[PDB]
Design a protein around this ligand. Structure first.
Ligand SMILES: Nc1nc2c(ncn2[C@@H]2O[C@H](COP(=O)(O)OP(=O)(O)OP(O)(O)=S)[C@@H](O)[C@H]2O)c(=O)[nH]1
Ligand SMILES: [Mg+2]
Lengths: 86, 182
């Protein structure tokens, strides 16, 4: 799961200038990912409500909503992991 | 793109009045498959109200009297309180001014409070009617919850069902707006 492990920075000197810049970039990316996921979720809730009024199955939408919250979770764990090395 | 505004939310209320399911249904879009009495848990939710992005910290507390000692330590930097009771339990509504309000006001005076009526789906539940009938009772009315809200000087009063997800977003958007005025 570790974003540091994913980036091959596992046991690197994280205080170095290059690494510190790469991490700031990653934090920015993550922040943008979270915001996008947040809006997709709010939109998905609107769809869930729209589907409720159409009288159709909410299963697909509920699954997307869960996948979206699950993604937000991962994004928060990684963002948290990088806040420790700023 | 700047970081989200941070605000911490604490939820309180009687045993099994639906506090955890409300937090999980909102933040994970999942209705907890098994009931597990809470001592203390915390989750993060993401929300946007009035064009403002907010990262909401959800602090889950215990309804049980057994853990009263722990609860006061969860109050310190709270931006908004979700004080709950269940619509299928008039006794849980009576504990609002009896136990929850006095405790919250003492540890968090000035902190916005949203009175929440949980399990709205049980109001018309026939089984709930027959059980409450025995105890010479009936499910909580919208007016009664709204009255109690006025009595404790709550920011607002909201009803919802974590089960059907009805009124869940409304509860959290109102709680966030209140926490923002801070
Ligand atoms: N019908 C219905 N049942 C609900 C709803 N929300 C929760 N419940 C049920 O009520 C019981 C208690 O819910 P839960 O959210 O765990 O309570 P709690 O207030 O967090 O309980 P505690 O930790 O203070 S002891 C559970 O069995 C749960 O499934 C709802 O909206 N409708
Ligand atoms: Mg709980």
């Amino acid at each position: 799961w570790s974003l540091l492990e994913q980036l091959g920075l596992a046991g690197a000197d994280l205080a170095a200038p290059g690494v510190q810049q790469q991490l700031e970039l990653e934090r920015e990316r993550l922040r943008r990912e979270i915001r996008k996921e947040l809006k997709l979720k709010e939109g998905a809730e609107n769809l869930r409500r729209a589907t409720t009024d159409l009288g159709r199955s909410l299963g697909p939408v509920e699954l997307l909503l869960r996948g979206s919250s699950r993604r937000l979770d991962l994004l928060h764990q990684q963002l948290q992991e990088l806040h420790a090395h700023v | 793109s700047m970081a989200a505004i941070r605000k911490k939310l604490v939820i309180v209320g009687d045993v099994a009045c639906g506090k955890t399911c409300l937090l999980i249904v909102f933040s994970k879009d999942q209705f907890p498959e098994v009931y597990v009495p809470t001592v203390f848990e915390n989750y993060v939710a993401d929300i946007e109200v009035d064009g403002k992005q907010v990262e909401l910290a959800l602090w889950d507390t215990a309804g049980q009297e057994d853990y009263d000692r722990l609860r006061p330590l969860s109050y310190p930097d709270t931006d908004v309180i979700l004080m709950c009771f269940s619509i299928d339990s008039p006794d849980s509504l009576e504990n609002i001014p009896e136990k929850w309000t006095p405790e919250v006001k003492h540890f968090c005076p000035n902190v916005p409070i949203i009175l929440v009526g949980n399990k709205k789906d049980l109001r018309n539940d026939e089984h709930t009617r027959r059980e409450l009938a025995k105890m010479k009772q009936e499910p909580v009315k919208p007016e009664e919850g709204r009255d109690m809200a006025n009595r404790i000087g709550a920011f607002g009063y909201m009803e919802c069902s974590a089960k059907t997800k009805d009124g869940v977003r409304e509860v959290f958007e109102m709680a966030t707006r209140a926490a923002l005025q801070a």
